[PDB]
Amino acid sequence: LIGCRRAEVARTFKEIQSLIHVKTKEFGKTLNIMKNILRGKSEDGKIDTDNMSGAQNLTYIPRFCSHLGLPMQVTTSAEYTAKKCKEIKEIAGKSPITIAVVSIYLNILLFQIPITAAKVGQTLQVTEGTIKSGYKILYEHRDKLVDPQLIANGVVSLDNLPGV
DNA sequence: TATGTACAACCGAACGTTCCATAGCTATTATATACACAGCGTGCT
């Protein structure tokens, strides 16, 4: 996990857990210990940048979109939505995985790709209820979650996003 | 001269299983906090 993060190609805890069979508690405690060790030998003996921070959600979006087979235009829109999604306090505390998945789902229905949430959550191993629950929060601020140029050109209109 | 007799020469070792010794992890209780996930139950169609 540290090695992936240092290379700017960071992965998620679940993705690494798919190969190495270790439950979450031991994983977290070991990671905290090793980070302290690296920091300790960075001062006495660099190590981290803006990347070392846990969330760094923008890095996950390109791979998650690839798993769904979306075009690059949707991926860029998802990155913009996820980047601006941190201004909302009702969602900012959520896990970076959900922040990226809900942003991807918002754009999937914005460009009208026929992929249902039942498969988006099944592909990225995220509960469908969580996806739709988060989508509701990412509906009161849609004007701030869509790139101005895309709406200006005419590629996407905000009336294609269903409203509850 | 002839015949006898005598003499001289030409099984190891690799692997597996059991037996001490030390240290560490596991489980439980309480509490605030918050997220995600897996259930159960009730109304709707």
XYZ file of C-alpha atoms (C1' of nucleotides) in Angstrom:
209
model
C 0.000 0.000 0.000
C 2.829 2.409 0.832
C 4.646 1.472 -2.367
C 1.581 2.127 -4.511
C 1.008 5.488 -2.813
C 4.613 6.603 -3.331
C 4.240 5.831 -7.055
C 1.114 8.010 -7.508
C -0.825 4.873 -8.521
C -2.245 4.253 -5.048
C -4.789 1.483 -4.531
C -7.530 0.938 -1.952
C -7.523 -1.267 1.131
C -10.117 -3.623 -0.356
C -8.131 -4.025 -3.578
C -5.010 -5.074 -1.673
C -7.098 -7.297 0.621
C -8.268 -9.169 -2.490
C -4.784 -10.727 -2.748
C -3.267 -10.671 0.756
C -5.646 -12.260 3.269
C -5.451 -9.856 6.214
C -8.451 -8.394 8.006
C -8.847 -4.662 8.423
C -7.748 -4.173 12.040
C -4.275 -5.686 11.653
C -3.854 -3.933 8.299
C -4.535 -0.508 9.788
C -2.373 -0.915 12.885
C 0.578 -2.168 10.839
C 0.209 0.672 8.331
C 0.192 3.261 11.120
C 3.284 1.684 12.690
C 5.217 1.549 9.418
C 4.348 5.152 8.559
C 5.664 6.231 11.961
C 8.843 4.215 11.369
C 9.374 5.819 7.961
C 8.746 9.261 9.457
C 11.108 8.458 12.321
C 13.906 7.511 9.925
C 13.075 10.505 7.721
C 13.995 12.887 10.553
C 16.926 11.045 12.136
C 17.893 9.378 8.852
C 11.866 12.282 1.777
C 8.822 10.099 2.565
C 5.476 11.793 1.996
C 3.779 14.472 -0.085
C 0.174 15.520 -0.693
C -0.298 11.959 -1.989
C 0.312 10.227 1.355
C -3.040 11.499 2.627
C -5.633 8.745 2.715
C -8.472 10.221 0.680
C -6.786 11.266 -2.580
C -9.980 10.147 -4.254
C -9.209 11.568 -7.706
C -6.673 8.774 -8.255
C -9.314 6.029 -7.979
C -11.730 7.406 -10.583
C -9.822 6.505 -13.796
C -9.549 2.832 -12.820
C -13.122 2.590 -11.523
C -14.428 4.070 -14.778
C -12.262 1.623 -16.730
C -13.866 -1.318 -14.928
C -17.239 -0.006 -16.129
C -15.955 0.695 -19.645
C -16.977 4.355 -19.787
C -15.545 6.787 -22.357
C -12.798 9.162 -21.293
C -15.170 12.148 -21.422
C -17.290 10.676 -18.622
C -14.157 9.962 -16.579
C -13.017 13.590 -16.781
C -16.491 14.762 -15.769
C -16.428 12.309 -12.859
C -13.059 13.685 -11.742
C -14.442 17.231 -11.795
C -17.545 16.178 -9.855
C -15.475 14.322 -7.259
C -13.054 17.247 -6.948
C -15.902 19.685 -6.263
C -17.769 17.162 -4.087
C -15.515 18.002 -1.116
C -17.170 21.416 -0.663
C -20.349 19.751 0.658
C -20.082 18.869 4.345
C -22.854 16.256 4.149
C -20.707 14.093 1.834
C -17.160 15.250 2.579
C -16.987 12.952 5.609
C -17.841 9.879 3.547
C -15.235 7.359 2.465
C -13.212 8.367 -0.622
C -14.434 5.214 -2.378
C -18.075 6.257 -2.025
C -17.193 9.842 -2.966
C -15.646 8.573 -6.202
C -18.332 5.968 -6.926
C -21.280 8.324 -6.438
C -19.584 10.954 -8.606
C -19.051 8.312 -11.298
C -22.682 7.209 -11.006
C -23.875 10.815 -11.251
C -22.027 11.222 -14.555
C -23.126 7.797 -15.826
C -26.745 8.969 -15.732
C -25.766 12.472 -16.888
C -24.489 11.201 -20.254
C -27.244 8.539 -20.266
C -25.141 5.372 -20.410
C -27.350 2.270 -19.878
C -25.609 0.955 -16.757
C -27.793 0.510 -13.681
C -26.684 1.049 -10.094
C -27.234 -2.667 -9.467
C -24.131 -3.350 -11.581
C -22.115 -0.245 -10.663
C -22.234 -1.310 -7.018
C -21.712 -4.948 -7.989
C -18.612 -4.086 -10.042
C -16.952 -1.737 -7.534
C -18.100 -3.860 -4.559
C -20.168 -1.046 -3.047
C -23.664 -1.398 -1.618
C -26.293 -0.158 -4.059
C -28.213 1.520 -1.244
C -25.119 3.537 -0.365
C -24.742 4.609 -4.004
C -28.334 5.822 -4.252
C -28.265 7.306 -0.744
C -25.198 9.365 -1.630
C -26.679 10.282 -5.010
C -29.528 12.078 -3.233
C -27.030 14.337 -1.451
C -25.289 14.893 -4.802
C -28.507 16.298 -6.261
C -29.094 19.525 -4.281
C -25.766 20.929 -5.543
C -25.794 19.704 -9.146
C -25.048 23.149 -10.586
C -21.733 23.055 -8.683
C -21.006 19.400 -9.561
C -21.053 19.639 -13.384
C -18.316 21.198 -15.482
C -19.427 24.616 -16.814
C -18.063 23.957 -20.308
C -19.942 20.677 -20.776
C -23.307 22.268 -19.967
C -22.400 25.349 -22.020
C -21.680 23.338 -25.177
C -24.848 21.241 -24.976
C -23.411 17.769 -24.450
C -25.151 17.368 -21.073
C -28.233 19.005 -19.573
C -29.181 18.836 -15.906
C -32.737 17.683 -16.712
C -31.386 14.263 -17.734
C -30.605 13.570 -14.053
C -33.699 12.057 -12.376
C -34.947 13.907 -9.316
C -36.578 12.391 -6.239
C 79.923 -108.964 -23.308
C 74.916 -108.832 -20.664
C 71.627 -107.686 -17.354
C 70.204 -104.763 -12.739
C 70.419 -100.776 -10.511
C 71.644 -95.997 -9.922
C 72.355 -91.287 -11.247
C 72.240 -86.839 -14.146
C 70.260 -84.162 -17.704
C 67.023 -82.296 -21.040
C 23.722 -48.233 4.807
C 23.080 -43.489 5.365
C 20.296 -39.557 5.690
C 15.780 -36.458 4.819
C 11.541 -35.627 6.575
C 7.887 -35.796 10.205
C 6.158 -35.791 14.752
C 6.283 -34.822 19.614
C 8.231 -32.247 23.706
C 9.955 -27.588 26.664
C 10.422 -22.560 26.886
C 9.286 -17.657 26.103
C 6.364 -14.087 24.472
C 2.223 -12.259 22.377
C -2.720 -12.163 20.770
C -7.797 -12.847 22.027
C -11.886 -11.932 24.530
C -14.962 -8.450 27.749
C -16.798 -3.379 29.626
C -17.708 1.453 29.274
C -18.127 6.005 26.399
C -18.240 9.726 23.039
C -17.851 10.042 17.703
C -19.292 8.578 12.450
C -19.195 5.753 8.328
C -20.429 1.441 5.692
C -22.689 -3.029 5.565
C -25.881 -6.667 6.607
C -29.909 -7.694 8.262
C -35.373 -7.321 9.687
C -39.977 -5.354 9.446
C -43.954 -2.563 7.229
C -46.422 -0.208 3.487
C -47.247 -0.373 -1.848
C -48.361 -2.321 -5.950
